[PDB]
């Protein structure tokens, strides 16, 4: 067949070249950094950091999202060209976590941007995040099209 | 073909030159200007003056970039919305027509061949030919060119040089001389002891 | 002068190049995930599970000490007397998006009913998959019991 | 197309360079009931598994999880784990499938459990 | 102390400088910026890339920790400390425990005291590895962070083997430490300490005498003793200027008196001096870790918690003795009461003096808990520090101040 | 076929086929350059680098390239739209275009012109306009700041770039790139190459090449820690791909020039192995390996410190060298060790 095998090639290229925005909010960013360090070497999967949203395919919301920060996160997400994927990493981003009942915290980053994968933990270990990134790759293989 | 190559470079230069002077965007003028110099370099190659063709590009690529720096340094505050043009176009057309009439009947003097100071040799490459005359027959002009360039050096510094005295500056050699052994040392601080 | 001479001969750059080449040819500590994994101690705080006794009965008796100590208020419990009169929960929820994975609940539990297990690879595609109810937590305990029990034995001398 | 799958993909049981590395340095330790094969180098200094099918880390059962993560020294082949009769077989992560866990009130359930905390009077 | 109107050595005054400054070059430096730590919005006014004004906007990670703490017991509040200067969490836990222990007048066991010193110095290396090598990345060195964070990975495994968490340990407790260390863990810490100086040499070989590194740090961000006193500087921010102030010596806590270590100080008080001080401190912390492991092995077996009315009993006792079960039940629900009073307990945290101002009122919950972050005072001085420098120096200055915004914002 | 290859058509096809050979080599090498660059940093960084996409990660660059082809092009609302798309086009086009005069073997050159050195200078310097115009046309502050830094970079490394190689022209007596290689032929393998008589200029050319390619320690127009992505902050998908392609093609050109000017091009380092295009490619990839190693071990200059190097170090040194070489060549010191002309 032509179109499904075309999507498979597109999904193969997008999974193998998944560039993530340099964007860490809190202590989930420490473990995200360890994921790129020698013990795990996230970049060996082709998953490399990019400073600019214009060159990013993946946003990892790694840390607490406060009300004051929510517009800035939405803006840089809006400036990602499509396709764009979002991973929610850790309790704060997943649902508010330890600060769920605070006056200044967004109770889950899915109130601001759509989310593809949720990684549990506070923080998730560097390996848990790596697992979550590979689950996103399974999701793209399962459902990826030219649109995303 | 030579005809196609000429008109490609000729039309490109003349159109680019016009766009330099009538366009309202100074940065667009900068880019039209470099296209005019590249197009003129193409014409020079067609005539076998390859060294001055390449020298012209090398020189004006850098010089036009410097012009861009001054455009943005002194950029007007009305970039978003950036005469007697009719009469000016009439005088320009008259001048161009007069030149065209003069070039219609162009013929060199019948003595022009015998008076050539530096006749061109088919077997000698252009750059070597220029080098054989530039520094010996034209040595006096060569030396005067050096002084012309010196005057530009002196003038630019005399006219414009100034330094902010309110910013933080580092001496690079002093930065490189900083000895870690001398700048950091370990202290035996006894318990309970402050400054 | 000695420092000026070494900078002229680019000694600082040469030393860096040599050090870089020594690292270049050295073994890499990189794990070949997912084939190769990082080390986990018996104390590791991972996914929650509800355990059973060796006789197959639930360990939880709805004391609610875990719900009381939880710093994140991630636990919600409702209990009644069971049909046989036993003190058991009817609701036991953990909001895994509120939980801070601190392990206070397993410290507070007097019967080792709630534990944090060794599993950490359970990322989900939807948020509500992380609202764990009682049956989900008990299913985790029935699948991970063998490893959980061994970890409890290993750390018992320190608890 | 079997060889191409090995050449072009990294999610099918192992990449080609993982296979070469295992052949050069791998020492078989045992197998699990799914057909995943476990290896070690340096007598257990390094430990890895070759997946039978999709390389999904959540496929490793609790039988081998402790050994693979260095929690326990000895493999389940030599020191098997004690299992209670009420235990249930291991399941991988089911998140993207129809077997994923969902709360009882979820709209995925197609029969969400209706909730109330009072009984209403019914007219005769 | 205001350079917005340019001053030239020839005394010239431009026509435009005469006009009032309405159209200035203002740029958002962060929050989404590799040098901004994710949550710093610094508004910079630039003049030919000279920084003339720096206006840090913080609070993008303010989570209301101090409000959330007022509705929780003292034990329920301990994990909040982990998440302030989250690069080295147990060091922040220590201030909370010390404040409670002072108000309750509690003495912690000897082994718990040694463990606290051991893992406090692990935290100092965890922080200084992050600070120094990401500071190098801020001036363009790609490799140092990779080498440094491999060593951090090993130390985070020592965290996990003590408490079951790589980062947020919740391990220091009012009354000691939650659990005792396995003997094989002490062997591995000793083995790691023997290798660690080699990595410090390798980082030193790559950076210390590199001419590019020197030209990015030497004579940048110069701090004098008088500047230190303007802005509440503590830690390496004062030691880099030559003030041999370290709370472990000046105001000793735990059992630091009996350890042998020295205080590195700088002579020029610039970014280069503070880099050298942090490298030296990493060597000193490694030596302390070695002494602590030796003392722990030489210790007689003892408890790690004070037990009594402050901490829960051991699980075996809880399941056997009626008094222990009651104390377990009560201390995990109500918790201990802290007598009315107010204390300020400070530690030499890796980033400077970290303190807790705790107002107790006799109940089981704090009345007020004010957290004093060293980075709050250090970041406030960036406008003064960065004035006159170029934009390229800004990331180096952010690095030298050692900012983590979990504690700046709280 | 003889009746064909002599015609205008057979002449026209010959040029097109020669052009495809250059594009095939340069673009094909680009697959392995981006891969090799990343593998070298990783090895120095105690890690693997790309190793899953294809065997040992060898298909990684195909995945990256394809990803950009199916990525959306975002055009900034305030950007100068023609100059916005002209900048990436010039960056890639001109870097590739410079290879038209690069010889790889005896007679393996598309254009054998007498002023090959100057043409290289003309094309590479015009390539900088892609960075200057790309930053300015985006109409945002970070690309705007990088645009000025790019102009500063040109002023820094070009003021002495001509002087650095004037010595090689003096020794050769030609600007023809093939002539420079033939001047390094002799009976002592690599001891006849110009790296020896012009050892100082090898260092100065290599450093200047790093600055010309915006490579560390002179990666100042991107400078992630200061400018987010510099002149590329507002570029996505294939327009962004063209800037990266141009960066590596320009780097590959400097690897060619280093090997041609100083290491005998396609000549054999040892007398008993034959000369050919294999030696040219081996030397080109050694110098690329040097480019990659430098990125892994050096920090970044401030761009005012780069200007200090160009004007207060390289300019006086290169000028002094030219005068010294002229005296040594004029008087045939050491028996024409510096006078290779006939
Ligand atoms: C024909 C040969 C032409 C080649 C030389 C070109 C002419 C340059 C002379 C101008 C120098 C000058 O004005 O400074 C004089 C310098 C004093 O300068 P200054 O204004 O007081 O400021 C000092 C610099 O700012 C302080 O230096 P800096 O911080 O700017 O760093 C630059 C550093 C870097 O130094 C260099 O790299 C310069 C080395 C000079 C190279 C020229 C000879 C090369 C010979 C060929 C050999 C092959 C290369 C191997 O150079 C110096 O330290 C300055 C020394 C003066 C250079 C003298 C030559 O010393 C003198 O007074 C000597 C005057 C004669
Ligand atoms: C003209 C010359 C200029 C340079 C050419 C251009 C650059 C090409 C781009 C490709 C760059 C490739 C980088 C390779 C780096 C590999 C790692 C390295 O340097 O060696 C380090 C490793 C050692 O670590 P380990 O694998 O954990 O070893 C454990 C095991 N017991 C063992 O000893 O292994 O040991 C190994 O990795 C051993 C195997 C080495 C693989 C040899 C092939 C490398 C490709 C060379 C291409 C030549 C062209
Ligand atoms: C033997 C060494 C060659 C000596 C020839 C003279 C070179 C003069 C260059 C010079 O002084 O300027 C340095 C210039 C200017 O540096 P600078 O700022 O120190 O200025 C020079 C000032 N002096 C010499 C007085 C100390 O260096 C640079 O611009 C940075 C170098 C870029 C990175 C180089 C990487 C090379 C690593 C490979 C080495 C090992 C390979 C095996
Ligand atoms: C040297 C030149 C290299 C040229 C570029 C190479 C990259 C282009 C090809 C893409 C790689 C193959 C690919 O896309 O794999 C998809 C498919 C995987 O199949 P499978 O994993 O069984 O299905 C999963 C369904 N979600 O693939 C396969 O199973 C492999 C089938 C062959 C496909 C070849 C491409 C046509
Ligand atoms: C086809 C290339 C064949 C390479 C494979 C050789 C076998 C090596 C076996 C071995 O022991 O290698 C060690 C190391 C491990 O690599 P990896 O498999 O990534 O690690 C898994 C760890 N569990 O293996 C490695 O580090 C191998 C890395 C392979 C790199 C191959 C590079 C190919 C060419 C790169 C570009 C060349 C540019 C052109 C140069 C022209 C002039 C010379
Ligand atoms: C390794 C690959 C080979 C390395 C060499 C690359 C050379 C490519 C440039 C070709 C130069 C050229 O223009 O060739 C002309 C030459 C004779 O042409 P002729 O008409 O006689 O003379 C021209 C008059 N001015 O023509 C010839 O004599 C033949 C030219 C060679 C054609 C073969 C090269 C094809 C390209 C290979 C692509 C794959 C390589 C990339 C892979 C990665 C490498 C690391
Ligand atoms: C008209 C009033 C009375 C005068 C009567 C004489 C008529 C000639 C008037 C000349 C004014 C017009 C301007 C053109 C000049 C023509 C020159 C001429 O005829 O020379 C002979 C000459 C013949 O060539 P020759 O035989 O090689 O000398 O004419 C040409 O063909 C010259 C071609 C000019 C090329 C134009 C390039 C345009 C570039 C793109 C610009 C946009
Ligand atoms: C072993 C794996 C091979 C993989 C492919 C290698 C590619 C090689 C690129 C081309 C050759 C470059 C040679 C560079 C000059 C060597 C520098 C050197 O060894 O410094 C001494 C350097 C000293 O560093 P120090 O230990 O810090 O003093 O030697 C070493 O430490 C060992 C490195 C030897 C490298 C030779 C093999 C090439 C890799
Ligand atoms: C991969 C790209 C291949 C590029 C074409 C290879 C031939 C290089 C050009 C050349 O030698 O001049 C044409 C050159 C002109 O004819 P000749 O004078 O008989 O060599 O060679 C040919 O006739 C072309 C033969 C190669 C055809 C391969 C096309 C696929
Ligand atoms: C020699 C010169 C070669 C071309 C140099 C590039 C400059 C010329 C292209 C300027 C295009 C301006 C279009 C602006 C616009 O609004 O259309 C976007 C235009 C409209 O979207 P579309 O309908 O999806 O094409 O987007 C593009 O993809 C434009 C691509 C430009 C292709 C030429 C490069
Ligand atoms: C700047 C650094 C200068 C280094 C000084 C090297 C002295 C070489 C003198 C060669 C004398 C000679 O016979 O010249 C004509 C000689 C002509 O040889 P032909 O071109 O093979 O006829 O010069 C050359 O072009 C080749 C000379 C190769 C011998 C170099 C020996 C260097 C050994 C030390 C390497 C380290
Ligand atoms: S989820 Fe936990 S580790 Fe992650 S940012 Fe929030 S508090 Fe920090
Ligand atoms: S681990 Fe901590 S936050 Fe999570 S449920 Fe248990 S007590 Fe609550
Ligand atoms: S899990 Fe344990 S602490 Fe929680 S209610 Fe059940 S028995 Fe009590
Ligand atoms: Ca000003």
Curated annotation (Swiss-Prot), chain A:
Q: What is its EC number?
A: 7.1.1.-
What note does UniProt attach to the cofactor annotation? Answer: Binds 1 [4Fe-4S] cluster.
- What enzyme category does the UniProt record give? translocase
**Which terms in the Gene Ontology molecular function aspect does this entry carry?**
4 iron, 4 sulfur cluster binding; iron ion binding; NADH dehydrogenase (ubiquinone) activity; NADH:ubiquinone reductase (non-electrogenic) activity; quinone binding
Q: Which GO terms describe its cellular component?
A: plasma membrane; respiratory chain complex I
Cofactor(s) needed by this chain: [4Fe-4S] cluster
> Is Membrane one of the keywords?
yes
An example GO biological process term is: electron transport coupled proton transport
> How does the record say this protein sits in the membrane?
Peripheral membrane protein
Provide the protein's localization. Cell inner membrane
Residues bound to [4Fe-4S] cluster = 27-28, 92, 122
Catalytic reactions on record? a quinone + NADH + 5 H(+)(in) = a quinol + NAD(+) + 4 H(+)(out)
Q: Which UniProt keywords apply?
A: 4Fe-4S, Cell inner membrane, Cell membrane, Iron, Iron-sulfur, Membrane, Metal-binding, NAD, Quinone, Translocase, Transport, Ubiquinone
Report the function annotation for this chain.
Answer: NDH-1 shuttles electrons from NADH, via FMN and iron-sulfur (Fe-S) centers, to quinones in the respiratory chain. The immediate electron acceptor for the enzyme in this species is believed to be ubiquinone. Couples the redox reaction to proton translocation (for every two electrons transferred, four hydrogen ions are translocated across the cytoplasmic membrane), and thus conserves the redox energy in a proton gradient.
Its family? Belongs to the complex I 20 kDa subunit family.
Q: What is this protein called?
A: NADH-quinone oxidoreductase subunit B
Species per Swiss-Prot/TrEMBL record: Paracoccus denitrificans (strain Pd 1222)
Q: Which gene encodes it?
A: nuoB
Curated annotation (Swiss-Prot), chain C:
Listed under catalytic activity are: a quinone + NADH + 5 H(+)(in) = a quinol + NAD(+) + 4 H(+)(out)
What is the membrane topology listed in the Swiss-Prot or TrEMBL record? Peripheral membrane protein
| Cellular localization per UniProt | Cell inner membrane
* Residue sites binding [4Fe-4S] cluster 1 per the record: 60, 63, 66, 109
Judging by the UniProt lineage, the source's domain of life is Bacteria
- Determine if Lyase is one of this entry's keywords: no
- Keywords (A to Z) from UniProt: 4Fe-4S, Cell inner membrane, Cell membrane, Iron, Iron-sulfur, Membrane, Metal-binding, NAD, Quinone, Repeat, Translocase, Ubiquinone
The family annotation for this protein states:
Belongs to the complex I 23 kDa subunit family.
Role summary: NDH-1 shuttles electrons from NADH, via FMN and iron-sulfur (Fe-S) centers, to quinones in the respiratory chain. The immediate electron acceptor for the enzyme in this species is believed to be ubiquinone. Couples the redox reaction to proton translocation (for every two electrons transferred, four hydrogen ions are translocated across the cytoplasmic membrane), and thus conserves the redox energy in a proton gradient.
Concerning HAMAP family, the annotation shows: NDH1_NuoI
Q: What is this protein called?
A: NADH-quinone oxidoreductase subunit I
Q: What is the lineage of its organism?
A: Bacteria, Pseudomonadati, Pseudomonadota, Alphaproteobacteria, Rhodobacterales
As recorded in Swiss-Prot or TrEMBL, the protein's gene is named: nuoI
Swiss-Prot record, chain E:
Keyword presence, Cell division: no
What catalytic activity is recorded? Answer: a quinone + NADH + 5 H(+)(in) = a quinol + NAD(+) + 4 H(+)(out)
UniProt keyword list: Cell inner membrane, Cell membrane, Membrane, NAD, Quinone, Translocase, Transport, Ubiquinone
What Gene3D superfamilies does the database record attribute to this sequence? Cytochrome-c3 Hydrogenase, chain B (1.10.645.10)
GO molecular function (one): quinone binding
- Short name of one Pfam family for this protein? Complex1_49kDa
Which SUPFAM superfamilies does this chain map to?
HydB/Nqo4-like (SSF56762)
What is the residue range of the signal peptide feature?
none
Q: Name one GO cellular component term.
A: plasma membrane
Enzyme Commission number(s) from the entry: 7.1.1.-
Q: What are the TM regions of this chain, as residue ranges?
A: none
Topology versus the membrane: Peripheral membrane protein
> Which compartments is it annotated to reside in?
Cell inner membrane
**Listed InterPro entries:** NADH_Q_OxRdtase_suD, NADH_UbQ_OxRdtase_49kDa_CS, NDH1_su_D/H, NiFe-Hase_large
Complex formation: NDH-1 is composed of at least 14 different subunits, Nqo1 to Nqo14. The complex has a L-shaped structure, with the hydrophobic arm (subunits Nqo7, Nqo8, Nqo10 to Nqo14) embedded in the inner membrane and the hydrophilic peripheral arm (subunits Nqo1 to Nqo6, Nqo9) protruding into the bacterial cytoplasm. The hydrophilic domain contains all the redox centers. NADH-quinone oxidoreductase forms a supercomplex with ubiquinol-cytochrome c reductase complex (complex III or cytochrome b-c1 complex) and cytochrome c oxidase (complex IV), which stabilizes the NADH-quinone oxidoreductase complex.
Q: Which family does it belong to?
A: Belongs to the complex I 49 kDa subunit family.
User: This protein is called what?
Assistant: NADH-quinone oxidoreductase subunit D
From Swiss-Prot, chain F:
Report which gene this protein is encoded by: nuoH
**Which terms under GO biological process does the entry name?**
aerobic respiration
- The main place the protein resides is membrane
Relate the assembly described in the record. Answer: NDH-1 is composed of at least 14 different subunits, Nqo1 to Nqo14. The complex has a L-shaped structure, with the hydrophobic arm (subunits Nqo7, Nqo8, Nqo10 to Nqo14) embedded in the inner membrane and the hydrophilic peripheral arm (subunits Nqo1 to Nqo6, Nqo9) protruding into the bacterial cytoplasm. The hydrophilic domain contains all the redox centers. NADH-quinone oxidoreductase forms a supercomplex with ubiquinol-cytochrome c reductase complex (complex III or cytochrome b-c1 complex) and cytochrome c oxidase (complex IV), which stabilizes the NADH-quinone oxidoreductase complex.
Q: What is this protein called?
A: NADH-quinone oxidoreductase subunit H
UniProt-recorded Gene Ontology molecular function terms: NADH dehydrogenase activity; oxidoreductase activity, acting on NAD(P)H, quinone or similar compound as acceptor; quinone binding
- What is the role of this chain? NDH-1 shuttles electrons from NADH, via FMN and iron-sulfur (Fe-S) centers, to quinones in the respiratory chain. The immediate electron acceptor for the enzyme in this species is believed to be ubiquinone. Couples the redox reaction to proton translocation (for every two electrons transferred, four hydrogen ions are translocated across the cytoplasmic membrane), and thus conserves the redox energy in a proton gradient. This subunit may bind ubiquinone.
């Amino acid at each position: 067949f032509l179109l499904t095998t075309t999507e498979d090639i597109i999904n193969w290229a997008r999974n193998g070249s998944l560039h993530w925005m340099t964007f860490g909010l809190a202590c989930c960013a420490v473990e995200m950094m360890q994921t790129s360090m020698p013990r795990y070497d996230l970049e060996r999967f082709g998953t490399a950091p990019r400073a600019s949203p214009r060159q990013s395919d993946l946003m990892i919301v790694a840390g607490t999202l406060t009300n004051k920060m929510a517009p800035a996160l939405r803006k840089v997400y809006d400036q990602m060209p499509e396709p764009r994927y979002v991973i929610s990493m850790g309790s704060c981003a997943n649902g508010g976590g330890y600060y769920h009942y605070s006056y200044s915290v967004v109770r889950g980053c899915d109130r601001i941007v759509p989310v593809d994968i949720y990684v549990p933990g506070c923080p998730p270990t560097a390996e848990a995040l790596l697992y979550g990134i590979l689950q996103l790759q399974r999701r793209i293989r399962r459902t990826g099209t030219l649109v995303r | 073909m030579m005809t196609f190559a000429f008109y490609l470079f000729a039309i490109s230069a003349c159109v680019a030159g016009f766009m330099v002077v009538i366009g309202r965007n100074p940065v667009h003028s900068v880019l039209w200007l470099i296209l005019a110099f590249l197009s003129a370099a193409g014409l020079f190659v067609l005539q076998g003056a390859e060294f001055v063709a390449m020298l012209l590009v090398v020189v004006y690529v850098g010089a036009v970039a410097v012009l861009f720096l001054f455009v943005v340094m002194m950029l007007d505050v009305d970039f978003a919305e950036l005469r007697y043009l009719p009469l000016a176009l009439v005088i320009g057309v008259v001048l161009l027509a007069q030149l065209g009439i003069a070039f219609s009947g162009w013929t060199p003097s019948d003595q022009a061949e015998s008076l050539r100071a530096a006749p061109v040799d088919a077997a000698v490459e252009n750059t070597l030919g220029l080098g054989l005359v530039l520094y010996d027959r034209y040595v006096l002009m060569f030396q005067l060119a050096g002084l012309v360039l010196l005057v530009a050096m002196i003038g630019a510094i005399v006219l414009t040089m100034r330094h902010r005295k309110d910013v933080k500056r580092q001496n690079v050699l002093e930065q490189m001389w900083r000895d870690p052994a001398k700048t950091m040392e370990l202290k035996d601080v006894k318990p309970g002891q402050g400054l | 002068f000695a420092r000026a001479t070494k900078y002229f001969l680019m000694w600082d750059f040469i030393k860096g190049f040599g050090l870089g080449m020594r690292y270049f040819v050295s073994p890499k500590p990189t794990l070949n995930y997912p084939h190769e994994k990082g080390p986990l101690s018996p104390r590791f705080r991972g996914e929650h599970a509800l355990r059973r006794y060796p006789n197959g009965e639930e360990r939880c008796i709805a004391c609610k000490l875990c719900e009381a100590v939880c710093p994140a208020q991630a636990i919600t419990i409702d209990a009644e007397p069971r049909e046989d009169g036993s003190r058991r929960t009817t609701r036991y929820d953990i909001d895994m998006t509120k939980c801070i994975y601190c392990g206070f609940c397993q410290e507070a539990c007097p019967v080792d009913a709630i534990v944090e297990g060794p599993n950490f690879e359970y990322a989900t595609e939807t948020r509500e998959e992380l609202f764990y109810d009682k049956q989900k937590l008990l299913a985790n305990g029935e699948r991970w019991e063998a490893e959980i029990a061994r970890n409890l034995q290993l750390d018992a001398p320190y608890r | 197309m079997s060889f191409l799958l090995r050449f072009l993909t990294w999610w099918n049981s192992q990449t080609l360079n993982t296979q070469v590395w295992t052949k050069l340095y791998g020492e078989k330790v045992g197998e699990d009931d799914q057909g995943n094969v476990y290896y070690q180098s340096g007598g257990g200094k390094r430990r890895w598994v070759i997946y039978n099918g999709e390389s999904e880390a959540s496929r490793i059962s609790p039988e081998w999880h402790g050994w693979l993560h260095h929690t326990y020294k000895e493999p389940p082949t030599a020191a098997p784990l004690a299992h209670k009769p009420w235990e249930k077989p291991h399941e991988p992560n089911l998140t993207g499938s129809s077997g994923a866990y969902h709360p009882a009130g979820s709209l995925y359930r197609a029969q969400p459990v209706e909730r109330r905390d009072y009984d209403a009077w019914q007219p005769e | 102390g205001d350079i917005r109107k340019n001053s030239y050595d020839d005394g010239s005054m431009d026509a435009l400088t005469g006009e009032q400054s309405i159209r200035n070059f203002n740029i958002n430096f962060g929050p989404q910026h590799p040098a901004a730590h994710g949550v710093l919005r610094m508004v910079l006014e630039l003049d030919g890339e000279i920084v003339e004004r720096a206006d840090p906007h913080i609070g993008l990670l303010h989570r209301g920790t101090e409000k959330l703490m007022e509705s929780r017991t003292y034990l329920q509040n301990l994990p909040y400390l982990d998440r302030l200067d989250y690069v080295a969490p147990m060091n922040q836990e220590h201030a909370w425990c010390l404040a409670i222990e002072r108000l309750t007048g509690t003495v912690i066991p000897r082994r718990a005291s040694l463990i606290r010193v051991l893992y406090s110095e692990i935290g100092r290396i965890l922080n200084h590895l992050m600070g120094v090598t990401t500071g190098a990345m801020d001036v363009g060195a790609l490799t140092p962070p990779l080498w440094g964070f491999e060593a951090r990975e090993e130390l985070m495994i020592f965290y996990e083997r003590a408490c079951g968490a790589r980062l947020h340990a919740a391990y220091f407790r009012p009354g000691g430490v939650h659990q005792d260390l396995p003997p094989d863990l002490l062997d591995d810490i000793e083995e790691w300490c023997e290798r660690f100086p080699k990595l410090v040499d390798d980082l030193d070989t790559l950076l210390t005498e590199n001419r590019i590194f020197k030209q990015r740090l030497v004579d940048i961000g110069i701090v004098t003793e008088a500047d230190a006193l303007d802005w509440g500087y503590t830690g390496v921010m004062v030691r880099g200027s030559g003030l041999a102030w370290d709370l472990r010596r000046s105001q000793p806590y735990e059992c630091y008196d009996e350890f042998d270590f020295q205080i590195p100080v700088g002579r020029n008080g610039d970014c280069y001096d503070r880099y050298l001080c942090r490298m030296a401190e990493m060597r000193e912390s490694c030596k302390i870790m070695q002494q602590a492991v030796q003392k722990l092995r030489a210790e007689p077996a003892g408890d790690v918690l004070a037990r009594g009315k402050l901490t829960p009993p051991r699980r075996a006792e809880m399941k056997r003795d009626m008094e222990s079960l009651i104390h377990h039940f009560k201390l995990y629900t109500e918790g201990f009461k802290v007598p009315a009073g107010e204390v300020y307990a400070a530690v030499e945290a890796p980033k400077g003096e970290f303190g807790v101002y705790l107002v107790a009122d006799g109940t089981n919950k704090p009345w007020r808990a004010k957290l004093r972050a060293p980075g709050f005072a250090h970041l406030q001085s960036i406008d003064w520090m960065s004035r006159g420098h170029m934009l390229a120096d800004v990331p180096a200055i952010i690095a030298t101040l050692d900012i983590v915004f979990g504690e700046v914002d709280r | 076929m003889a009746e064909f290859w002599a015609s205008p058509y057979g002449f026209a096809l010959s040029m097109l086929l020669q052009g495809l050979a250059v594009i095939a080599f340069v673009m094909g090498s680009l697959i392995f350059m981006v891969y090799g660059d990343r593998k070298i940093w990783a090895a120095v960084q105690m890690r693997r680098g790309p190793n899953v996409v294809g065997p040992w990660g060898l298909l990684q660059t195909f995945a990256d390239a394809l990803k950009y082809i199916v990525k959306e092009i975002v055009i900034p609302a305030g950007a100068d739209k023609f100059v916005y798309f002209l900048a990436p086009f010039l960056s890639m086009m001109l870097a590739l275009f410079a290879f038209v005069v690069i010889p790889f073997d005896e007679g393996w050159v598309m254009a054998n012109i007498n002023v090959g050195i100057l043409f290289i200078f003309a094309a590479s310097s015009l390539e900088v306009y892609g960075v200057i115009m790309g930053g300015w046309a985006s109409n945002s502050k970070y690309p705007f700041l990088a645009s000025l830094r790019s102009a500063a970079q040109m002023i820094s490394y070009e003021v002495s770039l001509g002087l650095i190689i004037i010595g090689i022209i003096i020794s050769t007596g030609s600007m023809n790139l093939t002539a420079i290689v033939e001047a390094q032929r002799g009976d002592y393998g690599l001891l006849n190459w110009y790296w020896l008589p012009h050892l100082p200029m090898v260092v100065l050319f290599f450093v200047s090449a790093l600055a010309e390619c915006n490579r560390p320690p002179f990666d100042l127009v991107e400078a992630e820690s200061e400018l987010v992505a510099g002149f590329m902050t507002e570029y996505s998908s294939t327009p962004y791909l063209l800037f990266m392609a141009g960066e590596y093609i320009a780097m590959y050109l400097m690897c060619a020039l280093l090997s041609l000017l100083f290491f005998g091009g396609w000549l054999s380092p040892v007398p008993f192995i034959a000369d050919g295009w294999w030696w040219m490619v081996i030397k080109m990839w050694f110098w690329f390996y040097m480019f990659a190693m430098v990125k892994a071990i050096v920090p970044r200059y401030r761009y005012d410190q780069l200007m200090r190097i160009g004007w207060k170090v390289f300019l006086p040194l290169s000028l002094g060298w030219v005068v010294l070489v002229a005296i040594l060549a004029r008087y045939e010191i050491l028996g024409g060790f510096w006078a290779r002309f006939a």
